[PDB]
Design a protein around this ligand. Structure first.
Ligand SMILES: NC(=O)c1ccc[n+]([C@@H]2O[C@H](COP(=O)([O-])OP(=O)(O)OC[C@H]3O[C@@H](n4cnc5c(N)ncnc54)[C@H](O)[C@@H]3O)[C@@H](O)[C@H]2O)c1
Ligand SMILES: NC(=O)c1ccc[n+]([C@@H]2O[C@H](COP(=O)([O-])OP(=O)(O)OC[C@H]3O[C@@H](n4cnc5c(N)ncnc54)[C@H](O)[C@@H]3O)[C@@H](O)[C@H]2O)c1
Ligand SMILES: NC(=O)c1ccc[n+]([C@@H]2O[C@H](COP(=O)([O-])OP(=O)(O)OC[C@H]3O[C@@H](n4cnc5c(N)ncnc54)[C@H](O)[C@@H]3O)[C@@H](O)[C@H]2O)c1
Ligand SMILES: NC(=O)c1ccc[n+]([C@@H]2O[C@H](COP(=O)([O-])OP(=O)(O)OC[C@H]3O[C@@H](n4cnc5c(N)ncnc54)[C@H](O)[C@@H]3O)[C@@H](O)[C@H]2O)c1
Lengths: 334, 334, 334, 334
């Protein structure tokens, strides 16, 4: 139905493309990057993390062809030259990681697009949305540049919503043991973050994250109640959130998990998941939900301090949420 | 001075041997394992984690020779046949990981040894000691089988002591992002812990740990105040403790770090360290201290919740503490 | 059809089971290992290398239930106590790694089995077979303890066959950059092979291999003409054979690749495959063929020396060849 | 003595600096990259591969201060704006990776430099040199832009020299199982080489290499006789050359190894080394030689075909050869 365009056909760009294939309401008709159709086609066909694409892929002229459907391939470094309007693209997924500021993301709008979804925390966005938590705050009339937050926030926000509405959160701190990403470095190179400058596959790398505070963006009641950090480790994909929080009401482990399980089977079905299996990160590769509670890890002290651990395929979960948001926005009128 | 014997010449056994080379008060005269002198000599000479041994190594007869010093090599599976007494071994470092129960560890005593140091949490030990925290509780007259706890507890205990004596700990939870060890599995094999059964270098593996509760063994005041877990990740060595705790007194980040830094330069010098550099796990390989505070990671909410992150070379730090304990015990009289 | 038993439900054991699900001529009614049905069921369902098994898996008291069918679980360290005869098991896949010698493998026969397939190079086996190369040499009346060779031999033999019949091999040498396996070590531990004693996920590890020599067991004409080595590297699965050989007939790269391709689309279809894609090891995880030619790597000098590179999923290709062999052996009468 | 400048303070840049500290004939007075003195100082002090630099490192306003000496830090993306002449820099090590073509490298000369050492295979260089093989061909009056070849060529050339002079090489093919480098990608990203575009730490990655052909630049007699490929694997450093060659003279493994050993203890000492130890890649990290023969791997068939395996720390060996070359070039007059 709605024509979509992806700017930055990378880990998120391609994952989003695959998710879109499952939703007949959104049609990805064009992608943009900094290489040729040949290369983008080869990357989409063979993925080191998610395997071989289950569809026919070819190159026709200077474009891609997926299961007979033709996808326009652009290679414009400057978003202003994307002419999205010219080909009827209404929604643009900004996943280059270079245009998180509104002044840059808005270039897609000048190019003819109607809505822009920044696939990451943003700067001066009209609004930040986490599906299953605050999509209702989206306002078609004023929100044109939207942020889908980070995968980490998308994992924490949902169960943080549950703990707070069910038991009340006084304060809490989190740590996300996160798989390395392309923002890091192969072997000790310059980086604004002296931590991320170090060989990604050789160390446990502590780094700062705003995912905790960003939760306040979608859950205002929690402003100033959370903070945390990240630890990048030697895994190519799949991460996990570890939250330690002080609760108002007195509770037991069973209660906490019971609340989380009910929410996952209820109002958060498809967003929050609940597992009582003793699994590891590899088992969650391909997971489409935003957050799966590792129930066996639930822990409580004095009935006031709790530890909740949740899994998330940082590439997949988030990309599926991007498509949900794109469909949600389209259904609101363009 | 005191003759030492090492049972289980592995990651800890060999690391302990190297540490002993630096202390003229302890002399390691015999090691036992399940292989031949040739093999143990080759392992001691070339280490994948700590590099080539800086000393001359050879094999003479059925024994090892390190810088001209001869080390007896035994290959007795059953500790009772070690005849430590016959060669004058008074202290035995039990690092096979198979004899953590007192009934097994005591076999070294029947063999003629006077004291046994179990290099891990134990079962029914006469006492568990963490150097810099409770070595004063050691009683030469009644403590013959001693536990040096785990490397994780050795990392947490010291700064937990400081936070509690300085600000008072109501309760706290910790998570140790830990390098894989030989207790794990290369590729999905049977293991009592269905988590540790999974390919160690391919996933982030959540696992349970008693390091938090074990802190109570050396710091009785903290009984029932702590609990936590571990996450084994794809790194061959070096781990980090992440503690989230509720404090009694109201404090600031600067205060917390100031207290930790003073303790590291004071009463805990050589045990607790303090760093304000943005480093990663590889930078701590070879670290001899038990715990180095990553000050930049210190974080506080409402002046009541704090996050303290500390580094520890799980093999090296602990092994150096084993030698300290052996010397400490010897100085108490055998 | 013919009932099979798996002794050693490990990487090959469980992969052999997966393949058997697709082969109507064979049925797995029992497996034996050193643990409980709950551990094996958990391992069968969650695989760090091949993902979640696409089938119903549960535990029936003391047995496994896969897609309704009930699999009997044994835990006999001694093959002589398996009593295969009491459950009608005719063919036993010996994949423990401990019974590669006929004296030991033959115990399954004493236990009621009729044929034993050793999943690896063996000692004193009645015959060594490489599917697609010499299954014709199989003698139902004389061969009871059969070896399915190694996965490396299964990868090399098929195209070595093609090269020799088509151009004649004077002599050659190979190196297989092979993924690590459970025969190695996590962190420097005793091992008969001092190279394999070293941390598997940390180095490139040269180790000897008899795969090249073994080719002669299935292709007599190549006796004494081939030799090689292995290099274990930090990947969990998938390997590649690198053969450099002197040919009798003068050839060009195009002619060598054409012969390999024709053989793959002809007589060796399903056993040998041919690829002109610039792929990497991760791309062959799950591959069921025994050998896939990496055509872009084919090289020639003076029209006499050639380099042929072929990929292989050491777990899947081999495990499927084992099932193929079991079905073949059965079609000959037991 | 002669003042040197390093353009590109990366893996080779910083390793070249470490080696220069030990060479009295050369002094590094300035380095150029794309960041601030604080970033470079932090990278120089903490290395994920080679550990903490054993020296005093600090920042003096806008420059580096190593063991007292002050190093000027530049940040000019355009080599033409380096003004080496104004600071007396005579020799410049071009190790950015972006200026391997003479048209670009020659800019340093236009900037006041007298000689330029390109740390890699080059295009239109006045001459390519492999230390210990053909430095004699150097012409101070005609050669201004010199290439120090690749680390792979530096590893292969020295023993290829020995084999040819001693037995005569008819033809051969090599494969270098090489550690990943910064030229690769963290997670499937565009790259001219579709193989190198794939996650470096997740697969075995075949890639082309001109190292074998390049040998002819330093050993004319071997022109058109050698060829090969590379296989990038999941290790951060250290590589190994695997050469299979047809010899003119009939030989035994013992004679080949004896020749290699004699050459290592003779004319090629310090360049070529010989080892009879069963080591692994981690053992050669820090090795300063260009090539170390793994004698246990030497193999021969029909007394004519031989396989020689040699190790090399692609970062350290090469970087030291660069310093050696710089000192040599200087001893010839600038
Ligand atoms: N990787 C994760 O787990 C994850 C999860 C959620 C959100 N994100 C966010 O999504 C964004 C992209 O992340 P990624 O991991 O996919 O990165 P990536 O580096 O893998 O992909 C980025 C793609 O954008 C292209 N690109 C860069 N500049 C371009 C330009 N100017 N014009 C057009 N194309 C250009 C690159 O060629 C590349 O293919 C970031 O903002 C990041 O923080 C990442
Ligand atoms: N690895 C760490 O980071 C770490 C840190 C602190 C404490 N520990 C503890 O120390 C112990 C050993 O750990 P490791 O990592 O060195 O293990 P390891 O497996 O590397 O070494 C154990 C050694 O003991 C030998 N051994 C086993 N059974 C034997 C027997 N019956 N008799 C004689 N020798 C035998 C093995 O051959 C091996 O060399 C464990 O209890 C463990 O929990 C480990
Ligand atoms: N992994 C590969 O790439 C590969 C490929 C081809 C052939 N092989 C061969 O197959 C065999 C097994 O290899 P793997 O990788 O599956 O090993 P593995 O260690 O993963 O599996 C072996 C299984 O056998 C069990 N076992 C051990 N002793 C036992 C006993 N006495 N009785 C019953 N069960 C016992 C273990 O518990 C384990 O689950 C070896 O001979 C090996 O060389 C391995
Ligand atoms: N890494 C090895 O194993 C190895 C061995 C031998 C030769 N080499 C060669 O040496 C060169 C560099 O390799 P590396 O591994 O050190 O790479 P690297 O990426 O680690 O280092 C390159 C450095 O150059 C800097 N740089 C890039 N453009 C610049 C510019 N225009 N001006 C100034 N600085 C700039 C980067 O910031 C970086 O720090 C390559 O040509 C490579 O082929 C690498």
């Amino acid at each position: 139905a709605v024509k979509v365009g992806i700017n930055g056909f990378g880990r998120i760009g391609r994952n989003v493309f695959r998710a879109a294939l499952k939703n007949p309401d959104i049609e990805v008709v064009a992608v943009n990057d900094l290489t040729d159709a040949n290369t983008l086609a080869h990357l989409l066909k063979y993925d080191s993390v998610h395997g071989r694409l289950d569809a026919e892929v070819s190159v026709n002229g200077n474009n891609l062809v997926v299961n007979g459907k033709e996808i326009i391939v652009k290679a414009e470094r400057d978003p202003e030259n994307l002419a999205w309007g010219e080909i009827g693209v209404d929604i643009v997924v900004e996943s280059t990681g270079r245009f998180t500021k509104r002044e840059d993301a808005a270039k897609h709008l000048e190019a003819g697009a109607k809505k822009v979804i920044i696939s990451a925390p943003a700067k001066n966005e009209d609004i930040t949305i986490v599906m299953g938590v605050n999509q209702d705050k989206y306002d078609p009339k004023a929100h044109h540049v939207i942020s889908n937050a980070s995968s980490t926030t998308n994992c924490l926000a949902p169960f943080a919503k549950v703990l707070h509405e069910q038991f009340g959160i006084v304060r809490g701190m989190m740590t996300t043991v996160h798989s390395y990403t392309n923002d890091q470095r192969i072997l000790d190179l310059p980086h604004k973050d002296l931590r991320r400058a170090r060989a990604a596959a050789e160390s446990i790398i502590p780094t700062t994250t705003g995912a905790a505070k960003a939760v306040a963006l979608v859950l205002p009641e929690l402003k100033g109640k959370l903070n945390g950090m990240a630890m990048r480790v030697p895994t190519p994909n799949v991460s996990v959130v570890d939250l330690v929080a002080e609760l108002e009401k007195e509770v037991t482990v069973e209660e906490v998990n019971a609340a989380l399980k009910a929410a996952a089977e209820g109002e958060l079905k498809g967003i929050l998941a609940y597992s009582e299996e003793p699994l590891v990160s590899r088992d969650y590769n391909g997971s489409t939900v935003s957050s799966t509670i590792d129930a066996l890890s639930t822990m409580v002290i004095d009935g006031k301090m709790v530890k909740v651990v949740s899994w998330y395929d940082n590439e997949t979960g988030y990309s599926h949420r991007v498509v949900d948001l794109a469909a949600y926005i389209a259904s609101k009128g363009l």
